[PDB]
Structure formats: C-alpha cells, structure tokens
Design a protein around this nucleic acid. Sequence first.
DNA 1: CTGGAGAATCCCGGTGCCGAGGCCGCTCAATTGGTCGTAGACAGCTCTAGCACCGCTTAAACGCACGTACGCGCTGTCCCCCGCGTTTTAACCGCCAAGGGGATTACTCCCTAGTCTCCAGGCACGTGTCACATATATACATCCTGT
Length: 48
Amino acid sequence: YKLVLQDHQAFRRKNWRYLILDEAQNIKNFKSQRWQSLLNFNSQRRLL
DNA sequence: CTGGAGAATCCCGGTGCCGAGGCCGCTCAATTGGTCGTAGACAGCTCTAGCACCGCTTAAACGCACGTACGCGCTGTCCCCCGCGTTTTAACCGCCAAGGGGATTACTCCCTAGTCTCCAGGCACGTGTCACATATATACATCCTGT
C-alpha cells in the first residue's frame, strides 16, 4: 500500500484478473487514501 | 573528429480522472422613465508671467599635451563546489477518542454623522521695521621729489 498508493497511475490502467489484498484492515475506512486509490482498480475478481 | 556507447529525451499512440463547459432556475442588479438641482462650459476681462531679446563679463567648457595608473590578458595552482552513491530522516500516512472555534447571516436598535444653517475668529495678505550685505569718506601711510 505504501507503494500502490502513489503509483496508481501505472496500475490503474491494467487488466488484472484477480485482485488480492492481504490485511485488508488497512482499508478499514473509506476516508483513508487507499480505499479510494484502490477502489477503481480495473479487475475481474476481488479478494480480501 | 569521429566513433562508440549511453543515457536522456521525446514522439506517439492509449486511457481513465476531473475540471471545463453548459444548462436551469431563481435574485438581484442594471434599465427604464422622469424630475431636479448642480457642474462646468463657455463667453469675456485682467494682468501675470513667459518669451525675446540685447549687452558686458568671465567662468567655463575645451582642445592638447603628457605622463601614470588603472584595465585586460595571461598564468599558475590550488580550494571548494559538482556529480553521484549511500545512510538518515522527515514527511506523508493511519489510528482513536468526542465535540467545538470561528467565519457567516441576520435583526433589531441607536449613537453617530450628514445636512444645513447662521455667524465670528483665525489664518492669507498687506505693511513695519531689523539683521546681514554693499558702497563709499578718511586719517593716516608708503614711494617720489625737490632740496
């Protein structure tokens, strides 16, 4: 997260098949800049 | 002066993010219509500067000549910033309480301030002198001359 948060420009425009997030508690709230950064990530399937 | 690498740009096509534009709906602020004292414009009148000289005086600008001193280039070499790689660190998070701190809106109200008088005293103007600058008698005062 300390990385994808600010490099989302390169990852957002990608055709991910499975999106996996370990320790999803970092996305506990939608006011933390990660929930937003990771929300619109183009992916087919999502796993928390 | 080329190669020969080697990074750096930099085309160029791609793709969502989000500001730019547009549309809707009221509010308010510019228009309309009309009345009403000024602003200032314009037509004189005055007389103050502004301009235009002219002469005499001489400071000053000026050209020249003539060094010296400062300017520029050169040189040497020697410090202190540049380039770049590593360790450090501060700047971003995210967290976890529970509520206010303060611009913003609004309504009475009421002191303060405009407006508009009439005055009269205090400050622009005319005039009286006094401090500094100016130009001239003067009582000796230094060469010149009869003697």
